[PDB]
Design a protein around this ligand. Structure first.
Ligand code: MMM
Ligand code: PMP
Lengths: 352, 352
């Protein structure tokens, strides 16, 4: 089953094999040093700035998302929405009483900085939340510009980097980000179960909220910074993430962005040749190709057909449920060979 | 490094090797089949009653602990405390504004049902919380007795079964338990990263509190009962957990208890002969051997000495910090070969 879902992603033998290494306690100095190494690799990708909290939470990307909200002392929070996942952010903010304010943009269209700027003048915000690459629509948002605006309005900048960290240009310092996170199974090509996070110094000062125990970043810091006991960690996953991080760094994000952009380009031409149409109206996300099937072809049915043909892709989600095919070009998904196989399966699927 | 910490525990080869199976999407029909398989096995160990919610949360035992509290509509909650982990239960209950009422018992001593009976007559509790086996003290609490008292009081019965599920006789129905949980790395001897949970129909009816997103059991239910999307799951851990669950059912809980109790008695005599003394004053937990060191020997120093000899054990925690050694007799920890090596390393350590 070729894995072309825009998360989880294919795992390199080298990484998955790391899960075979001898099991150890979560407080074993060796594991503590493995955790130290992980922080250093993640810092090279995150570029978080001194005094920042860098860790890998024991959960999926969503845990990382909620941790960046549940610990916030207060709202209001300007949630920039243009997709299913920024919608999830607003959903979590509301749940936690951060009195979120939604600034909506049409699915398939990028968030507009000019619009953001005007919204920031209307009220004072403690935090502004954005999703770097909106997986549900295949849209890349202008985070660097947004971050500059947030800093001007004196608001913390929360950024979902699931579809970008490890594959596209990323830097918290450069984008003025106060909180970033991803999942171990995204562009990092590691097995799912961990959620790398990064909280700047200013984020930590504002993170005095106490609404959850498991996701309390203060408790998390005690283990990741001081080696104290918070809760038992998925040690084996830690092994795999460290190995996965070395792999990413050996290649370098520049080369990884090229892989994605190149394949994205010809796959779209191949799909347009077959009647498909790109979903994003502008500012496409290189790591996730989202397309509408040919007229008269049911997207979800096509996903089921592709599965039967040996290839797993994703259907739409949130605003695009039942309307598209979402193709992963994150990590090992972004491979010429993988997509040539996908096209063979697609043709078999379309013939039925 | 021989892993004899009372959690995590050594992992069977058959179990760890399952982590090498082909990665799949969290919604892949094959994975959903594995999940239903997981539920079947856990229901066999939990014996939760009809309509109960059974699942494996993506997180450590602590996530399972908080999940049964953060989802509770209202308190007050009578938290029976006699160890570090029942104290954690109290800390979570407070955070979530469930008005916890703590009833303390001396560390090293089991909770007394008669004292609980009186407390339950002093006030009407929405829930009664207990730790089946307190890992910090090596004490086994009278879960069955307390559950009968809870049912009479009309209170939901919350039970931490981390050191008991998968090794000691257990049944939510027989014990009147409404919420039970454990971790994958405990008696199940699987890789850490998952937290098996079981909520009774009555717990589900009362679980209408919305305080956390990730740990919302209603959302978890949507994925584990209807195959819907909640968040990406640790797919490889799921593969491993199921394999570990089968290993448990193939041996049988009755036989696993016997295995643990047999080693407990033998190791304890060997340790007494060497000047060690049992920490529990009554009702010793067969799955966790807690001992005080010989005269003149420091507990934490001995733990480091053992590590230097290639053996990993835990020192005290919470109320027993620096006063004891805690040896794991859970899952693969309960093996003669393992503890014979322990004694060899121990005598080398004691010689210095
Ligand atoms: C932008 C974005 N943020 C957060 C998440 C949450 O991560 P996790 O909890 O699923 O680990 C996803 C996952 N989106 C997936 C890959 C999974 O449903 C998809 O279907 O787009 C995502 O695309
Ligand atoms: C009795 C008890 N309860 C809960 C837990 C929580 O598990 P974890 O460390 O896997 O979060 C533990 C293990 N620390 C425990 O021993």
């Amino acid at each position: 089953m070729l894995l072309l879902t825009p998360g989880p992603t294919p795992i390199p033998e080298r990484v998955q094999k790391a899960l075979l290494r001898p099991m150890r306690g979560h407080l074993d100095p060796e594991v503590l040093r493995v955790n130290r190494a992980i922080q250093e690799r993640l810092a090279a990708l995150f570029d978080p700035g001194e005094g920042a909290l860098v860790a890998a939470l024991a959960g999926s990307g969503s845990l990382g998302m909620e941790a960046g909200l549940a610990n916030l002392d207060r709202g209001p929070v300007l949630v920039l929405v243009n997709g299913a996942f920024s919608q999830r952010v607003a959903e979590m903010a509301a749940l936690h009483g951060l009195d979120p304010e939604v600034l909506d943009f049409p699915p398939g269209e990028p968030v507009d900085p000019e619009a953001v700027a005007r919204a920031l003048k209307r009220r004072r915000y403690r935090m502004v939340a954005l999703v770097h690459g909106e997986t549900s629509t295949g849209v890349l948002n202008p985070a660097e510009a947004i971050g500059a605006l947030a800093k001007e309005a004196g608001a913390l900048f929360f950024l979902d980097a699931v579809t970008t960290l490890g594959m596209l240009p990323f830097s918290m310092r450069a984008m003025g980000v106060d909180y970033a996170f991803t999942g171990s199974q995204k562009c990092l090509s590691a097995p799912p179960g961990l959620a790398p996070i990064a909280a700047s110094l200013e984020a930590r000062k504002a993170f005095t909220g106490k609404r959850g125990w498991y996701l309390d970043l203060a408790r998390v810091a005690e283990h990741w910074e001081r080696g104290g006991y918070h809760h038992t960690t998925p040690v084996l996953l830690h092994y795999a993430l460290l190995e996965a991080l070395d792999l990413v760094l050996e290649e370098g994000v520049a080369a990884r962005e090229r892989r994605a952009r190149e394949v994205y380009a010809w796959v779209l031409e191949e799909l347009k040749a077959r009647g498909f149409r790109p979903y994003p109206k502008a500012s496409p996300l290189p790591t996730v190709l989202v397309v509408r099937p040919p007229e008269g072809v049911d997207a979800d049915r096509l996903v089921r057909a592709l599965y039967a043909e040996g290839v797993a892709v994703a259907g739409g989600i949130g605003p695009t449920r039942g309307q598209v095919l979402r193709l992963g070009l994150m990590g090992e998904g972004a491979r010429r060979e993988a997509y040539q196989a996908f096209l063979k399966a697609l043709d078999r699927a379309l013939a039925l």
